[PDB]
Amino acid sequence: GDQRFGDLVFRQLAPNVWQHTSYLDMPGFGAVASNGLIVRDGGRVLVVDTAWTDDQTAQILNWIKQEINLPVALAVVTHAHQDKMGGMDALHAAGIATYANALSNQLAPQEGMVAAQHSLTFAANGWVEPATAPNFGPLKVFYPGPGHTSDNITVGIDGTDIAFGGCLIKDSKAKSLGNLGDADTEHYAASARAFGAAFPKASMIVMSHSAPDSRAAITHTARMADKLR
Ligand SMILES: C[C@@H](O)[C@@H](C(=O)O)[C@H]1C[C@H](SCCNC=N)C(C(=O)O)=N1
Ligand SMILES: [Zn+2]
Ligand SMILES: [Zn+2]
């Protein structure tokens, strides 16, 4: 049930939730997929993560216009890497309010990214401070601790079986944890398990670079990270 729209792919995961997928050719290595989410919440649409580029992210907004036909109220991006924040200009051009971890926004210029318009901050237990995430509807944002990057955050979709681990979680068939260039290998395992504990009701785990998996993806990722300590 994958729908193609331009160079992007869209898959419905639940009555009010879709996965968006965009690709970037990396020289010598080929096209890399990156996933994010689109959530219908009453009379508005919420987006998790941009596509790799501005042009691709504009196509997400175009797809939303056609298939859902409701205004995009806000977007949350899960850390300061190109696959998650590469298309920020397309959102700001459309007047969509954007949110990121304060640390992601602090890092964005160093990473060549455009910072989100707004900053999220987090309690010592990892849950977002409600004052920084107003009107997020079903999006429950959790900072699990450093892992894939120092700033990585995760999102559960309230009222569904779905939680989004971003680039922190790999699927149960994954060989490696991928890019460890920016990673915290000491705390990764604990951060992956913290994401699992934060969303115990989630049975469908969506991640950046694999099709949705079961909760086994969290545990398998944690046990791979265990060996990096
Ligand atoms: C380019 C960056 O956005 C990078 C990142 O988020 O750090 C992307 C691409 C690699 S894909 C490598 C996975 N390899 C699997 N065989 C990756 C990942 O492994 O999570 N994320
Ligand atoms: Zn990343
Ligand atoms: Zn990634």
Q: How far is CA 59 from CA 71, 76, 158, 182, in A?
A: 15, 17, 26, 29
**Furthest C-alpha separation in the chain:** 47
Measuring CA to CA, which residue among 57, 59, 106 is closest to residue 79? 106
| 198 phi and psi angles, rounded to 5 deg | -70, -30
32 CB within 6 A, ligand 1: yes
79 CB within 6 A, ligand 1: no
Measured from the CA of 149, which atom of ligand 1 is nearest? 7
Domains of the chain: 1-229 (3.60.15.10)
Instruction: From 21, 149, 207, 208, give the residue whose CB has the most ligand 1 atoms within 8 Å, as the site to mutate.
Output: 208
65 CA to middle of ligand 3, Å?
26
Q: Which residues participate in the annotated binding site for Zn(2+)? A: 79, 81, 83, 148, 167, 209
Measuring CA to CA, which residue among 104, 187, 189 is closest to residue 151? 104
Measured from the CA of 79, which atom of ligand 1 is nearest? 6
* Inter-residue contact 203 to 161 (CB < 8 Å): yes
178 CB within 6 A, ligand 1: yes
* Structure's resolution in angstroms: 1.8
CB neighbours of 180 closer than 8 A, spacing ≥ 6? 228
* Inter-residue contact 63 to 10 (CB < 8 Å): yes
Method: X-ray
